[PDB]
Amino acid sequence: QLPWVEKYRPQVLSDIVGNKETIDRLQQIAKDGNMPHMIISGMPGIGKTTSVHCLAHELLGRSYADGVLELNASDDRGIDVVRNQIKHFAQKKLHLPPGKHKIVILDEADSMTAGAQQALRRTMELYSNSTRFAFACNQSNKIIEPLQSRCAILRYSKLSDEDVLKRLLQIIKLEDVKYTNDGLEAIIFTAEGDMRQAINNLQSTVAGHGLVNADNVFKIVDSPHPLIVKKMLLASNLEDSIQILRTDLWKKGYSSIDIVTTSFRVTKNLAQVKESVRLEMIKEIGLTHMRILEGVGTYLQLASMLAKIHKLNN
Amino acid sequence: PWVEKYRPKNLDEVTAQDHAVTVLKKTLKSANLPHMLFYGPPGTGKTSTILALTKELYGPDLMKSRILELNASDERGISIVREKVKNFARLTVSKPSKHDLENYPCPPYKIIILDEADSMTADAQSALRRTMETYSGVTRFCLICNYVTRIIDPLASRCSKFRFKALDASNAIDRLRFISEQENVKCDDGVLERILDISAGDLRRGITLLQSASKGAQYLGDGKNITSTQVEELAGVVPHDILIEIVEKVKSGDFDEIKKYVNTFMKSGWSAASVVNQLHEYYITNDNFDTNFKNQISWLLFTTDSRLNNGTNEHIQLLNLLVKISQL
Amino acid sequence: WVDKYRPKSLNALSHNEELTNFLKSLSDQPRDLPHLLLYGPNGTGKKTRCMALLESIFGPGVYRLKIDVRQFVTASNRKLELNVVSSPYHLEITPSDMGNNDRIVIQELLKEVAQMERYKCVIINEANSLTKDAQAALRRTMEKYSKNIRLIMVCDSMSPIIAPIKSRCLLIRCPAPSDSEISTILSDVVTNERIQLETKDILKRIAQASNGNLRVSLLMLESMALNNELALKSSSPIIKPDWIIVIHKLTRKIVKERSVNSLIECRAVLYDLLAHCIPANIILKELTFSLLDVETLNTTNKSSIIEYSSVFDERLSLGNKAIFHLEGFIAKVMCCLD
Amino acid sequence: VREEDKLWTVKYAPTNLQQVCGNKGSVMKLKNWLANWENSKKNSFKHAGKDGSGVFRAAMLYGPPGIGKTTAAHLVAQELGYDILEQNASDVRSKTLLNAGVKNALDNMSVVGYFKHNEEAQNLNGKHFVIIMDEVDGMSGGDRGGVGQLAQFCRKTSTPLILICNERNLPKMRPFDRVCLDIQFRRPDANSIKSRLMTIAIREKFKLDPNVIDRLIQTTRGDIRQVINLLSTISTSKAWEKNIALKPFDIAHKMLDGQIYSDIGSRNFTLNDKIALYFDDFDFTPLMIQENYLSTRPSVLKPGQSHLEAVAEAANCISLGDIVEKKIRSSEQLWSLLPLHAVLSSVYPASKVAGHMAGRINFTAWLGQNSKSAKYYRLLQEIHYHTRLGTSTDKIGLRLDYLPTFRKRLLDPFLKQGADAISSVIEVMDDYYLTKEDWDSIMEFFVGPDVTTAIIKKIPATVKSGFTRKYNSMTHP
Amino acid sequence: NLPWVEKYRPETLDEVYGQNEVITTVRKFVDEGKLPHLLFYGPPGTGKTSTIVALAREIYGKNYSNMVLELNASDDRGIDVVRNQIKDFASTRQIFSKGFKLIILDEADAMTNAAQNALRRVIERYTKNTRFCVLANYAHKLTPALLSRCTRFRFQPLPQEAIERRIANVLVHEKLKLSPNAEKALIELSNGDMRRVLNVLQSCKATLDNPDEDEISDDVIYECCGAPRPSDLKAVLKSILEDDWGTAHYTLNKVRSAKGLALIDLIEGIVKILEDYELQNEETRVHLLTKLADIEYSISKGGNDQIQGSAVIGAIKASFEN
Numbered sequence A: 001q002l003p004w005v006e007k008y009r010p011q012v013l014s015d016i017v018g019n020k021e022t023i024d025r026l027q028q029i030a031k032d033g034n035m036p037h038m039i040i041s042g043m044p045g046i047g048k049t050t051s052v053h054c055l056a057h058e059l060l061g062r063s064y065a066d067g068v069l070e071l072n073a074s075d076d077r078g079i080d081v082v083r084n085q086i087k088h089f090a091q092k093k094l095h096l097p098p099g100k101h102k103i104v105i106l107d108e109a110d111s112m113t114a115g116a117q118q119a120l121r122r123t124m125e126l127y128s129n130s131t132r133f134a135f136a137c138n139q140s141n142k143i144i145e146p147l148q149s150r151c152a153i154l155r156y157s158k159l160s161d162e163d164v165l166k167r168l169l170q171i172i173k174l175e176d177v178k179y180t181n182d183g184l185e186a187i188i189f190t191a192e193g194d195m196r197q198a199i200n201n202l203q204s205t206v207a208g209h210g211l212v213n214a215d216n217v218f219k220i221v222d223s224p225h226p227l228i229v230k231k232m233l234l235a236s237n238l239e240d241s242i243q244i245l246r247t248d249l250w251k252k253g254y255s256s257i258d259i260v261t262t263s264f265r266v267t268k269n270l271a272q273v274k275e276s277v278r279l280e281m282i283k284e285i286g287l288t289h290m291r292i293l294e295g296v297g298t299y300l301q302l303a304s305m306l307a308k309i310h311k312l313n314n
Numbered sequence B: 001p002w003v004e005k006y007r008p009k010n011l012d013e014v015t016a017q018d019h020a021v022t023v024l025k026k027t028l029k030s031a032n033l034p035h036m037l038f039y040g041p042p043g044t045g046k047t048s049t050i051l052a053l054t055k056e057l058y059g060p061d062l063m064k065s066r067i068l069e070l071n072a073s074d075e076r077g078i079s080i081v082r083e084k085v086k087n088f089a090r091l092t093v094s095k096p097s098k099h100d101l102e103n104y105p106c107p108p109y110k111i112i113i114l115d116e117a118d119s120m121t122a123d124a125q126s127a128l129r130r131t132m133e134t135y136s137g138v139t140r141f142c143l144i145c146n147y148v149t150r151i152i153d154p155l156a157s158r159c160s161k162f163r164f165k166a167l168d169a170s171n172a173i174d175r176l177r178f179i180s181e182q183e184n185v186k187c188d189d190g191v192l193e194r195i196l197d198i199s200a201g202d203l204r205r206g207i208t209l210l211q212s213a214s215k216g217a218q219y220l221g222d223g224k225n226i227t228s229t230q231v232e233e234l235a236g237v238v239p240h241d242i243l244i245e246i247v248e249k250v251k252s253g254d255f256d257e258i259k260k261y262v263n264t265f266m267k268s269g270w271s272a273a274s275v276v277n278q279l280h281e282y283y284i285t286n287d288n289f290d291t292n293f294k295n296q297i298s299w300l301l302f303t304t305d306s307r308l309n310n311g312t313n314e315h316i317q318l319l320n321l322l323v324k325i326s327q328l
Numbered sequence C: 001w002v003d004k005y006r007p008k009s010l011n012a013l014s015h016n017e018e019l020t021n022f023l024k025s026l027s028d029q030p031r032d033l034p035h036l037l038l039y040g041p042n043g044t045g046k047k048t049r050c051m052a053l054l055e056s057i058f059g060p061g062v063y064r065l066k067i068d069v070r071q072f073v074t075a076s077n078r079k080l081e082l083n084v085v086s087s088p089y090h091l092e093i094t095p096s097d098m099g100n101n102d103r104i105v106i107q108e109l110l111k112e113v114a115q116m117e118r119y120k121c122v123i124i125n126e127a128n129s130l131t132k133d134a135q136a137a138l139r140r141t142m143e144k145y146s147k148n149i150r151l152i153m154v155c156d157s158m159s160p161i162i163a164p165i166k167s168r169c170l171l172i173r174c175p176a177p178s179d180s181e182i183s184t185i186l187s188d189v190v191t192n193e194r195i196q197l198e199t200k201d202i203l204k205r206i207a208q209a210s211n212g213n214l215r216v217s218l219l220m221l222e223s224m225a226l227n228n229e230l231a232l233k234s235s236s237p238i239i240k241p242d243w244i245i246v247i248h249k250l251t252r253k254i255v256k257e258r259s260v261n262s263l264i265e266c267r268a269v270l271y272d273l274l275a276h277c278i279p280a281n282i283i284l285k286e287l288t289f290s291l292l293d294v295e296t297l298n299t300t301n302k303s304s305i306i307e308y309s310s311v312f313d314e315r316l317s318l319g320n321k322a323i324f325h326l327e328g329f330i331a332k333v334m335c336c337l338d
Numbered sequence D: 001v002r003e004e005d006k007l008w009t010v011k012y013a014p015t016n017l018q019q020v021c022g023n024k025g026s027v028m029k030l031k032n033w034l035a036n037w038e039n040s041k042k043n044s045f046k047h048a049g050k051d052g053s054g055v056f057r058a059a060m061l062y063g064p065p066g067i068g069k070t071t072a073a074h075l076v077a078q079e080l081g082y083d084i085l086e087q088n089a090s091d092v093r094s095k096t097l098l099n100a101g102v103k104n105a106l107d108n109m110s111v112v113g114y115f116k117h118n119e120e121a122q123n124l125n126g127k128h129f130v131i132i133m134d135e136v137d138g139m140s141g142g143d144r145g146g147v148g149q150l151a152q153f154c155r156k157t158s159t160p161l162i163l164i165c166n167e168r169n170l171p172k173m174r175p176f177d178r179v180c181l182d183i184q185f186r187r188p189d190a191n192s193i194k195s196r197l198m199t200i201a202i203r204e205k206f207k208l209d210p211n212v213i214d215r216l217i218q219t220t221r222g223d224i225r226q227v228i229n230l231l232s233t234i235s236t237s238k239a240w241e242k243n244i245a246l247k248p249f250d251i252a253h254k255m256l257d258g259q260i261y262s263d264i265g266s267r268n269f270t271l272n273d274k275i276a277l278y279f280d281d282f283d284f285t286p287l288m289i290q291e292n293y294l295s296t297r298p299s300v301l302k303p304g305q306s307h308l309e310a311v312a313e314a315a316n317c318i319s320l321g322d323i324v325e326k327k328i329r330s331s332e333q334l335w336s337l338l339p340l341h342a343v344l345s346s347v348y349p350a351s352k353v354a355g356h357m358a359g360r361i362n363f364t365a366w367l368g369q370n371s372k373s374a375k376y377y378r379l380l381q382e383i384h385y386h387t388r389l390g391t392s393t394d395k396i397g398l399r400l401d402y403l404p405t406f407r408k409r410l411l412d413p414f415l416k417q418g419a420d421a422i423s424s425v426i427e428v429m430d431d432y433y434l435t436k437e438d439w440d441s442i443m444e445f446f447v448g449p450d451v452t453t454a455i456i457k458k459i460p461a462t463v464k465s466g467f468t469r470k471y472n473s474m475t476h477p
Numbered sequence E: 001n002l003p004w005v006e007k008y009r010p011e012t013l014d015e016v017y018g019q020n021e022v023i024t025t026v027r028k029f030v031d032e033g034k035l036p037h038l039l040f041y042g043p044p045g046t047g048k049t050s051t052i053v054a055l056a057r058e059i060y061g062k063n064y065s066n067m068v069l070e071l072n073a074s075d076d077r078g079i080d081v082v083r084n085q086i087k088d089f090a091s092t093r094q095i096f097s098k099g100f101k102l103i104i105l106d107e108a109d110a111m112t113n114a115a116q117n118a119l120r121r122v123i124e125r126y127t128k129n130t131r132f133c134v135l136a137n138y139a140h141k142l143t144p145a146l147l148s149r150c151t152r153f154r155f156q157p158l159p160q161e162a163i164e165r166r167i168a169n170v171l172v173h174e175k176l177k178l179s180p181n182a183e184k185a186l187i188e189l190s191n192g193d194m195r196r197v198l199n200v201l202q203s204c205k206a207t208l209d210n211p212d213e214d215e216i217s218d219d220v221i222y223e224c225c226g227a228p229r230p231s232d233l234k235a236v237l238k239s240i241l242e243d244d245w246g247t248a249h250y251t252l253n254k255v256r257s258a259k260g261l262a263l264i265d266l267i268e269g270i271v272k273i274l275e276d277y278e279l280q281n282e283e284t285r286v287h288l289l290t291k292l293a294d295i296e297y298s299i300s301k302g303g304n305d306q307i308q309g310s311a312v313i314g315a316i317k318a319s320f321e322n
């Protein structure tokens, strides 16, 4: 077998779907070649690493194997590496087209020690005539302030719904899969922006149950069913909600964190109730979540959360 | 001092705490003692019981040979559990001489007593899981915690649970009478039970309060029985007369009078916020208020105590509590 | 000025004869001195009592002390330092400069001082800013070393101290000086400083307006003597510090005008007050008591004021950005008063 | 080799000492110290000439990142015609390696400086050394014994030794306490940076709105390299400043709109879209929402809830979101709490007090106030470290009580006694170990009716000169 | 000699109970030979470790000591460990190995985000020469990438039939008699963790083995577990709902003192009891749940015990007024 996320990974910059502004920025960068040092920040699985990889590929053409140094969390990045190997790579003579430059792609820059990030400063400041640096990070706060200021910051928003839907439809058309609209909406729901997780859940559903259907997705996700949680959060009499939470969710060994997270996610999408009541229900569920994370996970906390949600809905 | 010179070295001297310990008394002669987690209020006997058990089981030879006493004074990071705790959970048994087996049967396992595990990080507790599962046959673990909700549940599923009831406010008066008569201290009639109640939860606090009261009374050369006032003045609890003044002021009074009185109190009176406890006791044990009043009183007192728990200001919370209790 | 009239012995004390008698009693046992926990309002002179007790036990040379700096490495790779003022017989640890590393420094320093071998004294200032982990480490240190480290800790409102620590130490309190005794000390000061008083009513007036805080009373007497040319008459416009006047002007602006157009300037004044080394809790307490002092409000408004003040004081003690909670409290106050 | 393919920061680097924008005073101080270092060496570094800058061997540069410290140091060393022997973080500056490499060259001469030009009478310092230790703060864990060895290098040296760091008051930088002179580079003002950006823009044949330039200079928090690097992005025009550069402003503009939270608009813009709008920038959105949530004319008010109640509930939710953010930053592994924070600090107050913007969206100011509070707390901590020997108080009660009367005793004589009270003033200053800088710091911490920045300059400058020249003769410790 | 927790540990796939839905799947995976990376997650005391060790011993037989590497949580777990040990074990190919190795990471939810990123990159790199198996208690503290990379397996708690079968097998192989209500109270208090059951069984064995014939009554089980008996809960609730303030306070105090009861478990039992009452109104239930949750949250921080007890009594009383 073969993972779809690995098989259908975009190799050309145009195939990347998502942020429309920064992808066009990188398109013009590859068209010109004068790429500056850049940090790329954003939430996981929204197309950070693939973006910089495609950029380097399209920018260097046939010389990618000789003019690119990649360093992820697997490779050793301490003090000796940044002082010896990176410095000897930056000085390496290489005759490229007039606009191109050697590229150093540092993925998961957050794991790089601050003391290790110190050494990179003069190494990237001095040899900026034949070497450019591209950091890829989740949180741009763990990068030291000097490196934070030396390079251009590129933020990647979380994926919307129409973009993930378009990508999934492309994948289905290329793979000739049987599906339905409710299944795709369930994929969008369980993904919430993670293109990688969306594609993986799609492939797992197709491999396990063949047909992309709501019950199949909700049986392969191992998460509480969104319909039953919505019924819990929308029952008229409180005892019905308490009985639902007791018998249908608490007995089957679900983790309280998962229950609160699913309630949060379904309350976000309840497009039938008003907006203010949604915000207040989210506030209550979030207070209950903060209580849960502090060490107490008794059923009484979820019962009180449901009670307060009903008190608000009345 | 007195708190340590009359410390019980055997599990028989203790009389208030005899429920949880007994099972160990049944299994002391065997080598299959399960991993134990003591929990409860401080100053209960946990340290006393573990040291008495080590004295009755090991002896002076092996008291410090295969026992590792770790406290919050020692380094509580992952460094210790990696370097020394893991090394000591594996080390072999040491038998230096023959004067130990005469009075104490030595088991082939060992005991490590990791105290104050309440404030331990989750990663350190996951490491404790490994170091307890890998040497469960040759090494036994003793844990101490004041709050069970902080220590993670997978550990409590492995280690057996033991609670030490705070204190017995009925029979310990005889123990304190014995201590007083052997110390030849002349106290009043109704002071011993008062010393015990004001020191609720702890007994070490009780004996140290008795010691302080005696050492303060014997300075005057008065030769009279030390009354409850001298004890309540050293325990930090609020006197009863100023408490009656407070409750009369809050029973009938406007905002300005209450404000001025609490200003005077927080300025020159007893600077503690333990007056909430005294107010709760007085309002609960009283029989002159209806139920709908006592319900709101208990709720308001609980709210004020929960707010004071977070280390906030004393004056503002006390004034708010008294104003809200005056609104009824 | 004030430090020029600071007692240097228990006999030189001129206040709380009960307390000095009890300390003379306790100083009769230099070989066995239990741990002491002094608690009482600010400016009562607890540090004076402690240093006088030290001078009574040790030599009078305990007052000539030298400052020192000590830097150490933590479990991680951070090497941080603190400043301890030490004497030939005692040392004063003030775990306030460091934010969260209290436990490591207290553990290391106490364990290092407890291996010098007749004992040594460790004075812990601001014993309420100690994290519970640091407090537990201190209690275990007390449990281990008891023949070289006799702890004396001064603090105020000793609620954030766990009962495991209260049990071992002797609880001593220092009540604020009554207005009569404050007036007596002020009279002694103006006598030894030959200040031309027109009457003795100014002393009682200062004692009343000082709220039982001895040191601020002495210091405001100092501040007023340099504005009347050492001739204090009956017409004395009592001088308040700058921040108190700013807080009172803020209170008057809150009472007189109730709108967001004034809430903007209120936030500006809060920013200006905070950025000049002023805590949040002090601002909140002063603003609350000032708003309660105003005579135009009824009892319901005052009850709402004190309730919101309590809630936002808890939230200030739980949060980290004080401007948010202060602006929220003032907004709720303006809402209720509207 | 190409004029274009170089970055915009290296291509537009300063060349002289009149293009360095901001901090002219510190540059002139460094230049006048380096020029007179020769005569200071002649006098064995014991005669402090007219500035107290004749006894120090090493100069130390510090300040926020992106101001020109490295550029100023290099240009100052080059103008005098010296030879720059530079070592930085990328070199292993251990104790043994420093003793081997640099220590043997503290007093030697240069070969390249000799052979470059030695025949024409330009300047006699063409062959001397100027050792620049850049990023001394960057001494990581792999450089053992570096800070102490450099502190020892400060003394016993024979050539100008410039040092550069980013945080002077860091404990690791303590061994440089009094053994070297230290000047400070502040964040440049908006006028000089605006002039430099205008020069660059007209030089690159493109114009921008001055308001956009002001917003940029505000966002970058004074960093010049950062704003230049962000401006270089214009070539790759409202889309540029709308999407990439001025993103938090547009986030605040979209969130505070009144048409979104309406029933007609909410059906087109879901709540998930607003949470994504927050997630766009989760570092500046809470502060931006808190700064200007009370400067809009609302339109979503309830029938019976005025503006004040709405702003009060918004501030309550802001406080709750602040508590949630603190709980999050207590342990990063709880990033799952990030969406909840999203609704508390960001979405809820905006939805509560949405409407139409009255004026213009003002950038957040909490960062500058936090920096000012940190600086003043450092200064007060130093003052207490000095004065603790004779005050018997805590670091916070000092500012509360003692500072007003201290300011009175230290200044008010200068208002009524004229200038003969200096012998008394220093007397008080001799009792509390204070210095002239301590006097300035004490004079600084005052707000309200007792503002001193206006009053300080009213006294005659002759009194200041006399006080300074009289304090120089005595020393208390 | 060794404890029952270590003795009765299963050694084959047949000796696991109440997990057939996963056992058939792992048997399909072992007969197919296409065993991918696995994630086993669930509540403690369920059989994840036992199942994976039995599966490894079945697949590799005697080569288990060579091709199976077990790693636990925070074994000096910097990025350096994942860079050296796991990476060498994955990359290095044995001399006479056919197939792939197995690296089992026990309690691997205590890894930092950087450590989990290193692990996901490693598993991505050498996914052709070895397969991994990650064990977890909470599947919400793992990076979604590592979760998506492998196949999930949730371990639902042990049902009543499985635990009853296991305690029967333990009973027939030991010298103990068990009363009818004993197993009922056992299953009610254990909540479905086999480890706690095997611990408490040997505990009460060593506790009441005086004549080698005593019967384990519910008293000794409630003592060894440290849990209250439902009769005391009903009695204290009755006293609170019927008597006055002083008598109810004294009753609560004596019940929580003479037996050693924590307010947390007492509140759990009280709300469990109140869950099945026929309350006529609704506001009572809402106020009750809210106030009781607040009491539990406040107890979680260790306030003043008597104050929280009086607050519990006041909430229960003031809730039942309609």
Ligand SMILES: Nc1ncnc2c1ncn2[C@@H]1O[C@H](COP(=O)(O)OP(=O)(O)OP(O)(O)=S)[C@@H](O)[C@H]1O
Pocket (backbone or CB within 6 Å): A005, A006, A008, A009, A010, A015, A016, A017, A018, A043, A044, A045, A046, A047, A048, A049, A050, A051, A137, A138, A167, A195, A196, E145
């Ligand atoms: N916009 C996109 N279009 C198509 N595929 C995408 C997109 N974004 C993510 N993916 C898929 O997600 C997979 C995961 O790779 P990346 O997105 O590069 O991971 P990442 O963004 O670096 O997140 P990390 O590594 O956890 S910080 C890729 O192999 C793609 O198949």
Ligand SMILES: Nc1ncnc2c1ncn2[C@@H]1O[C@H](COP(=O)(O)OP(=O)(O)OP(O)(O)=S)[C@@H](O)[C@H]1O
Pocket (backbone or CB within 6 Å): B003, B004, B006, B007, B008, B013, B014, B015, B016, B017, B041, B042, B043, B044, B045, B046, B047, B048, B049, B144, B203, B204, C164
């Ligand atoms: N049940 C008891 N009977 C007699 N003396 C006791 C008892 N409990 C405590 N003591 C006395 O108190 C001291 C022992 O108390 P500890 O065992 O330290 O209490 P503790 O609960 O272990 O406190 P911790 O756990 O360190 S917070 C000795 O001086 C004993 O004499």
Ligand SMILES: Nc1ncnc2c1ncn2[C@@H]1O[C@H](COP(=O)(O)OP(=O)(O)OP(O)(O)=S)[C@@H](O)[C@H]1O
Pocket (backbone or CB within 6 Å): A146, D008, D009, D010, D012, D013, D014, D019, D020, D021, D022, D064, D065, D066, D067, D068, D069, D070, D071, D072, D165, D166, D196, D224, D225, D228
């Ligand atoms: N005053 C200035 N005017 C114009 N450009 C400046 C100025 N200061 C810095 N720069 C720019 O910044 C580049 C050099 O950066 P520096 O500010 O010298 O670095 P730095 O001051 O050492 O700060 P670090 O190294 O990050 S701590 C120059 O080439 C310019 O592009």
Ligand SMILES: Nc1ncnc2c1ncn2[C@@H]1O[C@H](COP(=O)(O)OP(=O)(O)OP(O)(O)=S)[C@@H](O)[C@H]1O
Pocket (backbone or CB within 6 Å): B154, E004, E005, E006, E007, E008, E009, E010, E015, E016, E017, E018, E019, E043, E044, E045, E046, E047, E048, E049, E050, E051, E107, E136, E137, E158, E166, E194, E195, E198
């Ligand atoms: N399904 C089961 N069938 C039979 N015995 C079991 C079962 N689950 C657990 N046990 C017994 O309980 C012991 C503990 O099992 P473990 O596999 O260690 O539990 P676990 O799944 O690893 O949960 P942890 O380690 O606390 S996260 C085993 O050695 C068995 O004796």
Ligand SMILES: Nc1ncnc2c1ncn2[C@@H]1O[C@H](COP(=O)(O)OP(=O)(O)O)[C@@H](O)[C@H]1O
Pocket (backbone or CB within 6 Å): C002, C003, C005, C006, C007, C012, C013, C014, C015, C041, C042, C043, C044, C045, C046, C047, C048, C049, C185, C214, C215, D391, D392, D393, D394
């Ligand atoms: N008995 C006394 N006689 C004269 N002055 C006193 C007496 N007690 C206290 N003081 C004065 O009170 C001032 C403040 O006391 P201090 O211990 O500094 O308060 P804090 O505990 O707030 O630091 C001291 O400067 C001292 O001069």
Ligand SMILES: [Mg+2]
Pocket (backbone or CB within 6 Å): A048, A049, A107, A108, A136
């Ligand atoms: Mg990546």
Ligand SMILES: [Mg+2]
Pocket (backbone or CB within 6 Å): B043, B045, B046, B047, B048
């Ligand atoms: Mg103990």
Ligand SMILES: [Mg+2]
Pocket (backbone or CB within 6 Å): D069, D070, D134, D135, D164
């Ligand atoms: Mg630099």
Ligand SMILES: [Mg+2]
Pocket (backbone or CB within 6 Å): E048, E049, E106, E107, E135
């Ligand atoms: Mg396991």
